[PDB]
Amino acid sequence: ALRRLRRDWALHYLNNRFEPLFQRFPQARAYLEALRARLARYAETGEPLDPAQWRPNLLTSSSSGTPPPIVYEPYATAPRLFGRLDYLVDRGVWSTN
Amino acid sequence: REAQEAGFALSTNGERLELTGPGPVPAELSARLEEVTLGSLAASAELEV
Amino acid sequence: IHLAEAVEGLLLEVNRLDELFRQGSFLREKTQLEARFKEAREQQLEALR
C-alpha cells in the first residue's frame, strides 16, 4: 500500500511535468507515457533508472532539406548500411541499451 | 523544540533516531522526525557533491 | 533536440521525485497510513489479549 501511495503520488506530480511535454510533443505520446510509467516504477520500487536505457537515440541530425541529406557510402557493408547494434560486456555477459 | 513541547524526548543513536515518551507518537511529529532524518541523509549527499 | 533536452530534464526529475518523498504532505500521508495500520494491529492484539 505504501508502494501504491508512492506510485500514485509520483504520477500526480509528474502529470504536471508531462502535460506541457505532451502538448509540446504529441507524436512522442507513447514514449513519454512509457517514461512516466518508468519514473513511477522507480518511485515505488526504488529500482535505479538507467539513463542510457531511457535516452532517445538521435540517429538523424535535423537537416533543412536544402541541401537534402546526401550520404555516400562507397564501402557499403551491413554494419555501415543498416547500422550495428552495439553491445557491452559485464561479467562476460553481452548487454545493450 | 517542536517535539518536547508535546512532552516527547528525542532519543538519538546516530543519523537515525526516535522519540521517547508516553504513548505512541502522533503522526505529525513522527513524520517530522523521519522527514528530518531523510533530509539529513540527502543533505550529507548534497554536501559531498 | 528539444525532445532530448526535455527527456534529460525528465531523467533528472528522479531527484525531484526523491525530494518529493521528503516533503511534508507526502510524508504526513505515509505516516497517517502506517499509523492507521498500526492502530489496527494493536486493536486486534488487545482484542486477542
PDB file of C-alpha atoms in Angstrom:
ATOM      1  CA  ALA A   1       0.000   0.000   0.000  1.00  0.00           C
ATOM      2  CA  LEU A   2       2.862   2.402   0.685  1.00  0.00           C
ATOM      3  CA  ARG A   3       4.327   1.402  -2.685  1.00  0.00           C
ATOM      4  CA  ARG A   4       0.948   2.234  -4.244  1.00  0.00           C
ATOM      5  CA  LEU A   5       0.938   5.587  -2.436  1.00  0.00           C
ATOM      6  CA  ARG A   6       4.438   6.390  -3.685  1.00  0.00           C
ATOM      7  CA  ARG A   7       3.489   5.409  -7.241  1.00  0.00           C
ATOM      8  CA  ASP A   8       0.276   7.428  -7.364  1.00  0.00           C
ATOM      9  CA  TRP A   9       1.824  10.488  -5.701  1.00  0.00           C
ATOM     10  CA  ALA A  10       4.629  10.301  -8.267  1.00  0.00           C
ATOM     11  CA  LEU A  11       2.086  10.020 -11.088  1.00  0.00           C
ATOM     12  CA  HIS A  12       0.137  13.003  -9.741  1.00  0.00           C
ATOM     13  CA  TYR A  13       3.323  15.076  -9.537  1.00  0.00           C
ATOM     14  CA  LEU A  14       4.556  14.002 -12.984  1.00  0.00           C
ATOM     15  CA  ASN A  15       1.228  14.791 -14.650  1.00  0.00           C
ATOM     16  CA  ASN A  16       2.040  18.496 -14.267  1.00  0.00           C
ATOM     17  CA  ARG A  17       5.526  17.880 -15.699  1.00  0.00           C
ATOM     18  CA  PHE A  18       4.429  15.721 -18.652  1.00  0.00           C
ATOM     19  CA  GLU A  19       1.293  17.591 -19.769  1.00  0.00           C
ATOM     20  CA  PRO A  20       3.319  20.547 -21.152  1.00  0.00           C
ATOM     21  CA  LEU A  21       5.625  17.960 -22.717  1.00  0.00           C
ATOM     22  CA  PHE A  22       2.579  16.090 -24.033  1.00  0.00           C
ATOM     23  CA  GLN A  23       1.418  19.277 -25.758  1.00  0.00           C
ATOM     24  CA  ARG A  24       4.951  20.053 -26.957  1.00  0.00           C
ATOM     25  CA  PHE A  25       5.488  16.531 -28.365  1.00  0.00           C
ATOM     26  CA  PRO A  26       2.107  14.965 -29.193  1.00  0.00           C
ATOM     27  CA  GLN A  27       3.819  12.499 -31.544  1.00  0.00           C
ATOM     28  CA  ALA A  28       6.017  11.311 -28.646  1.00  0.00           C
ATOM     29  CA  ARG A  29       2.952  10.470 -26.535  1.00  0.00           C
ATOM     30  CA  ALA A  30       3.761   6.753 -26.325  1.00  0.00           C
ATOM     31  CA  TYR A  31       7.395   7.330 -25.357  1.00  0.00           C
ATOM     32  CA  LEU A  32       6.502   9.989 -22.787  1.00  0.00           C
ATOM     33  CA  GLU A  33       3.801   7.786 -21.245  1.00  0.00           C
ATOM     34  CA  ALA A  34       6.229   4.863 -21.038  1.00  0.00           C
ATOM     35  CA  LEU A  35       8.868   7.091 -19.440  1.00  0.00           C
ATOM     36  CA  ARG A  36       6.346   8.428 -16.913  1.00  0.00           C
ATOM     37  CA  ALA A  37       5.381   4.847 -16.065  1.00  0.00           C
ATOM     38  CA  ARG A  38       9.066   4.003 -15.600  1.00  0.00           C
ATOM     39  CA  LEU A  39       9.543   7.016 -13.318  1.00  0.00           C
ATOM     40  CA  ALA A  40       6.545   5.913 -11.245  1.00  0.00           C
ATOM     41  CA  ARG A  41       8.020   2.401 -11.110  1.00  0.00           C
ATOM     42  CA  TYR A  42      11.317   3.846  -9.871  1.00  0.00           C
ATOM     43  CA  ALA A  43       9.451   5.944  -7.302  1.00  0.00           C
ATOM     44  CA  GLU A  44       7.594   2.957  -5.852  1.00  0.00           C
ATOM     45  CA  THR A  45      10.053   0.064  -6.241  1.00  0.00           C
ATOM     46  CA  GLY A  46      13.244   2.101  -5.911  1.00  0.00           C
ATOM     47  CA  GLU A  47      14.990   0.457  -8.870  1.00  0.00           C
ATOM     48  CA  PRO A  48      17.693   2.873 -10.127  1.00  0.00           C
ATOM     49  CA  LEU A  49      16.763   4.167 -13.563  1.00  0.00           C
ATOM     50  CA  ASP A  50      19.398   3.743 -16.268  1.00  0.00           C
ATOM     51  CA  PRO A  51      19.827   6.982 -18.270  1.00  0.00           C
ATOM     52  CA  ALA A  52      21.409   5.029 -21.138  1.00  0.00           C
ATOM     53  CA  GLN A  53      18.305   2.804 -21.321  1.00  0.00           C
ATOM     54  CA  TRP A  54      15.839   5.726 -21.474  1.00  0.00           C
ATOM     55  CA  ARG A  55      17.696   8.268 -23.622  1.00  0.00           C
ATOM     56  CA  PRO A  56      16.241   8.565 -27.147  1.00  0.00           C
ATOM     57  CA  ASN A  57      18.952   7.811 -29.695  1.00  0.00           C
ATOM     58  CA  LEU A  58      19.146  10.758 -32.112  1.00  0.00           C
ATOM     59  CA  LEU A  59      20.268   8.854 -35.193  1.00  0.00           C
ATOM     60  CA  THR A  60      19.392  11.752 -37.506  1.00  0.00           C
ATOM     61  CA  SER A  61      20.520  15.370 -37.373  1.00  0.00           C
ATOM     62  CA  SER A  62      17.818  17.900 -38.224  1.00  0.00           C
ATOM     63  CA  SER A  63      18.523  18.908 -41.824  1.00  0.00           C
ATOM     64  CA  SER A  64      16.834  21.803 -43.607  1.00  0.00           C
ATOM     65  CA  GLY A  65      16.469  19.745 -46.792  1.00  0.00           C
ATOM     66  CA  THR A  66      18.457  22.305 -48.809  1.00  0.00           C
ATOM     67  CA  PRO A  67      20.817  20.684 -49.394  1.00  0.00           C
ATOM     68  CA  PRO A  68      18.931  17.457 -48.648  1.00  0.00           C
ATOM     69  CA  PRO A  69      20.603  14.688 -46.625  1.00  0.00           C
ATOM     70  CA  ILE A  70      23.075  13.141 -49.068  1.00  0.00           C
ATOM     71  CA  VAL A  71      25.052  10.123 -47.847  1.00  0.00           C
ATOM     72  CA  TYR A  72      27.724   8.432 -49.961  1.00  0.00           C
ATOM     73  CA  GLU A  73      28.891   5.045 -48.646  1.00  0.00           C
ATOM     74  CA  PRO A  74      31.446   3.564 -51.070  1.00  0.00           C
ATOM     75  CA  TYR A  75      32.377   0.845 -48.547  1.00  0.00           C
ATOM     76  CA  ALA A  76      28.807  -0.398 -48.162  1.00  0.00           C
ATOM     77  CA  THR A  77      28.696  -3.185 -45.575  1.00  0.00           C
ATOM     78  CA  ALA A  78      25.744  -4.277 -43.448  1.00  0.00           C
ATOM     79  CA  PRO A  79      27.011  -2.581 -40.236  1.00  0.00           C
ATOM     80  CA  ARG A  80      27.799   0.548 -42.265  1.00  0.00           C
ATOM     81  CA  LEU A  81      24.482   0.423 -44.164  1.00  0.00           C
ATOM     82  CA  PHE A  82      21.836  -0.641 -41.633  1.00  0.00           C
ATOM     83  CA  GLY A  83      23.778   0.421 -38.536  1.00  0.00           C
ATOM     84  CA  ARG A  84      25.196  -2.024 -35.993  1.00  0.00           C
ATOM     85  CA  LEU A  85      23.525  -2.716 -32.648  1.00  0.00           C
ATOM     86  CA  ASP A  86      26.432  -2.247 -30.257  1.00  0.00           C
ATOM     87  CA  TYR A  87      26.802  -4.379 -27.139  1.00  0.00           C
ATOM     88  CA  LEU A  88      28.546  -4.031 -23.788  1.00  0.00           C
ATOM     89  CA  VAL A  89      30.064  -6.852 -21.742  1.00  0.00           C
ATOM     90  CA  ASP A  90      29.559  -7.024 -17.974  1.00  0.00           C
ATOM     91  CA  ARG A  91      30.801 -10.131 -16.142  1.00  0.00           C
ATOM     92  CA  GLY A  92      31.349 -11.629 -19.594  1.00  0.00           C
ATOM     93  CA  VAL A  93      27.652 -11.232 -20.483  1.00  0.00           C
ATOM     94  CA  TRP A  94      26.523  -9.360 -23.587  1.00  0.00           C
ATOM     95  CA  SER A  95      24.182  -6.444 -22.885  1.00  0.00           C
ATOM     96  CA  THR A  96      22.893  -3.383 -24.712  1.00  0.00           C
ATOM     97  CA  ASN A  97      20.665  -0.330 -24.314  1.00  0.00           C
TER      98      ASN A  97
ATOM     99  CA  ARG B   1      11.670  22.176  20.438  1.00  0.00           C
ATOM    100  CA  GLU B   2       8.575  21.165  18.465  1.00  0.00           C
ATOM    101  CA  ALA B   3       8.673  17.642  19.943  1.00  0.00           C
ATOM    102  CA  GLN B   4       9.471  18.418  23.594  1.00  0.00           C
ATOM    103  CA  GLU B   5       6.623  20.947  23.522  1.00  0.00           C
ATOM    104  CA  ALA B   6       4.411  17.853  23.210  1.00  0.00           C
ATOM    105  CA  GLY B   7       6.253  16.178  26.093  1.00  0.00           C
ATOM    106  CA  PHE B   8       8.353  13.840  23.936  1.00  0.00           C
ATOM    107  CA  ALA B   9      12.080  13.246  24.440  1.00  0.00           C
ATOM    108  CA  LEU B  10      14.140  12.931  21.249  1.00  0.00           C
ATOM    109  CA  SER B  11      16.432   9.932  21.719  1.00  0.00           C
ATOM    110  CA  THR B  12      19.350   9.893  19.273  1.00  0.00           C
ATOM    111  CA  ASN B  13      21.539   6.943  18.260  1.00  0.00           C
ATOM    112  CA  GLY B  14      23.214   8.371  15.165  1.00  0.00           C
ATOM    113  CA  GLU B  15      21.776   9.877  11.990  1.00  0.00           C
ATOM    114  CA  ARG B  16      18.664   7.773  12.577  1.00  0.00           C
ATOM    115  CA  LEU B  17      16.834   8.493  15.815  1.00  0.00           C
ATOM    116  CA  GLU B  18      13.496   8.046  17.567  1.00  0.00           C
ATOM    117  CA  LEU B  19      11.353   9.595  20.319  1.00  0.00           C
ATOM    118  CA  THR B  20      10.837   8.529  23.934  1.00  0.00           C
ATOM    119  CA  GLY B  21       7.631   9.421  25.747  1.00  0.00           C
ATOM    120  CA  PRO B  22       4.206   8.297  26.956  1.00  0.00           C
ATOM    121  CA  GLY B  23       2.096   6.541  24.351  1.00  0.00           C
ATOM    122  CA  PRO B  24       2.663   6.249  20.609  1.00  0.00           C
ATOM    123  CA  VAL B  25       3.961   9.304  18.784  1.00  0.00           C
ATOM    124  CA  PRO B  26       1.236  11.118  16.801  1.00  0.00           C
ATOM    125  CA  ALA B  27       1.563  11.209  13.031  1.00  0.00           C
ATOM    126  CA  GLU B  28       2.698  14.829  12.635  1.00  0.00           C
ATOM    127  CA  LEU B  29       5.861  14.773  14.756  1.00  0.00           C
ATOM    128  CA  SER B  30       6.791  11.229  13.700  1.00  0.00           C
ATOM    129  CA  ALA B  31       6.535  12.484  10.120  1.00  0.00           C
ATOM    130  CA  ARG B  32       8.723  15.427  11.119  1.00  0.00           C
ATOM    131  CA  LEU B  33      11.302  13.060  12.643  1.00  0.00           C
ATOM    132  CA  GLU B  34      11.561  10.782   9.618  1.00  0.00           C
ATOM    133  CA  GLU B  35      11.459  13.859   7.368  1.00  0.00           C
ATOM    134  CA  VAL B  36      14.432  15.463   9.105  1.00  0.00           C
ATOM    135  CA  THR B  37      16.428  12.225   9.108  1.00  0.00           C
ATOM    136  CA  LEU B  38      15.817  11.699   5.375  1.00  0.00           C
ATOM    137  CA  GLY B  39      16.704  15.348   4.827  1.00  0.00           C
ATOM    138  CA  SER B  40      19.901  14.922   6.839  1.00  0.00           C
ATOM    139  CA  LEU B  41      20.924  11.922   4.728  1.00  0.00           C
ATOM    140  CA  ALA B  42      20.205  13.671   1.426  1.00  0.00           C
ATOM    141  CA  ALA B  43      21.864  16.796   2.827  1.00  0.00           C
ATOM    142  CA  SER B  44      25.054  14.857   3.509  1.00  0.00           C
ATOM    143  CA  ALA B  45      24.803  13.600  -0.078  1.00  0.00           C
ATOM    144  CA  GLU B  46      24.469  17.116  -1.486  1.00  0.00           C
ATOM    145  CA  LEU B  47      27.208  18.228   0.929  1.00  0.00           C
ATOM    146  CA  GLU B  48      29.618  15.729  -0.604  1.00  0.00           C
ATOM    147  CA  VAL B  49      28.626  16.679  -4.146  1.00  0.00           C
TER     148      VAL B  49
ATOM    149  CA  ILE C   1      16.994  18.321 -29.788  1.00  0.00           C
ATOM    150  CA  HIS C   2      14.120  19.822 -27.794  1.00  0.00           C
ATOM    151  CA  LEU C   3      12.902  16.295 -27.067  1.00  0.00           C
ATOM    152  CA  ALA C   4      16.436  15.383 -25.974  1.00  0.00           C
ATOM    153  CA  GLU C   5      16.671  18.276 -23.521  1.00  0.00           C
ATOM    154  CA  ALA C   6      13.146  17.596 -22.233  1.00  0.00           C
ATOM    155  CA  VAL C   7      13.918  13.916 -21.637  1.00  0.00           C
ATOM    156  CA  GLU C   8      17.182  14.918 -19.950  1.00  0.00           C
ATOM    157  CA  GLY C   9      15.117  17.070 -17.604  1.00  0.00           C
ATOM    158  CA  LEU C  10      12.753  14.146 -17.042  1.00  0.00           C
ATOM    159  CA  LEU C  11      15.705  11.882 -16.220  1.00  0.00           C
ATOM    160  CA  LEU C  12      16.984  14.490 -13.761  1.00  0.00           C
ATOM    161  CA  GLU C  13      13.467  14.518 -12.270  1.00  0.00           C
ATOM    162  CA  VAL C  14      14.494  11.417 -10.288  1.00  0.00           C
ATOM    163  CA  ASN C  15      15.971  13.799  -7.714  1.00  0.00           C
ATOM    164  CA  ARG C  16      12.718  15.780  -7.780  1.00  0.00           C
ATOM    165  CA  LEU C  17      10.796  12.569  -7.087  1.00  0.00           C
ATOM    166  CA  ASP C  18      13.177  11.756  -4.230  1.00  0.00           C
ATOM    167  CA  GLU C  19      12.788  15.218  -2.698  1.00  0.00           C
ATOM    168  CA  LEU C  20       9.020  14.919  -3.075  1.00  0.00           C
ATOM    169  CA  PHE C  21       9.227  11.879  -0.791  1.00  0.00           C
ATOM    170  CA  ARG C  22      10.841  14.049   1.910  1.00  0.00           C
ATOM    171  CA  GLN C  23       8.138  16.735   1.712  1.00  0.00           C
ATOM    172  CA  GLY C  24       5.661  17.427   4.485  1.00  0.00           C
ATOM    173  CA  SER C  25       2.456  16.446   2.686  1.00  0.00           C
ATOM    174  CA  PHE C  26       3.537  13.080   1.262  1.00  0.00           C
ATOM    175  CA  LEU C  27       5.286  12.085   4.483  1.00  0.00           C
ATOM    176  CA  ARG C  28       2.242  13.093   6.530  1.00  0.00           C
ATOM    177  CA  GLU C  29       0.106  10.896   4.268  1.00  0.00           C
ATOM    178  CA  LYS C  30       2.521   7.974   4.658  1.00  0.00           C
ATOM    179  CA  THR C  31       2.642   8.365   8.442  1.00  0.00           C
ATOM    180  CA  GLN C  32      -1.155   8.525   8.630  1.00  0.00           C
ATOM    181  CA  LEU C  33      -1.324   5.321   6.573  1.00  0.00           C
ATOM    182  CA  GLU C  34       1.189   3.458   8.730  1.00  0.00           C
ATOM    183  CA  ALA C  35      -0.457   4.831  11.886  1.00  0.00           C
ATOM    184  CA  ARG C  36      -3.908   3.564  10.917  1.00  0.00           C
ATOM    185  CA  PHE C  37      -2.442   0.169  10.004  1.00  0.00           C
ATOM    186  CA  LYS C  38      -0.524   0.084  13.285  1.00  0.00           C
ATOM    187  CA  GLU C  39      -3.531   1.009  15.434  1.00  0.00           C
ATOM    188  CA  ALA C  40      -5.469  -1.722  13.634  1.00  0.00           C
ATOM    189  CA  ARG C  41      -2.690  -4.093  14.690  1.00  0.00           C
ATOM    190  CA  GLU C  42      -2.814  -3.012  18.348  1.00  0.00           C
ATOM    191  CA  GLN C  43      -6.613  -3.191  18.454  1.00  0.00           C
ATOM    192  CA  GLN C  44      -6.507  -6.740  17.062  1.00  0.00           C
ATOM    193  CA  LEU C  45      -3.754  -7.677  19.519  1.00  0.00           C
ATOM    194  CA  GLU C  46      -5.600  -6.218  22.519  1.00  0.00           C
ATOM    195  CA  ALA C  47      -8.796  -7.987  21.463  1.00  0.00           C
ATOM    196  CA  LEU C  48      -6.769 -11.206  21.497  1.00  0.00           C
ATOM    197  CA  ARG C  49      -5.306 -10.253  24.888  1.00  0.00           C
TER     198      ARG C  49
END
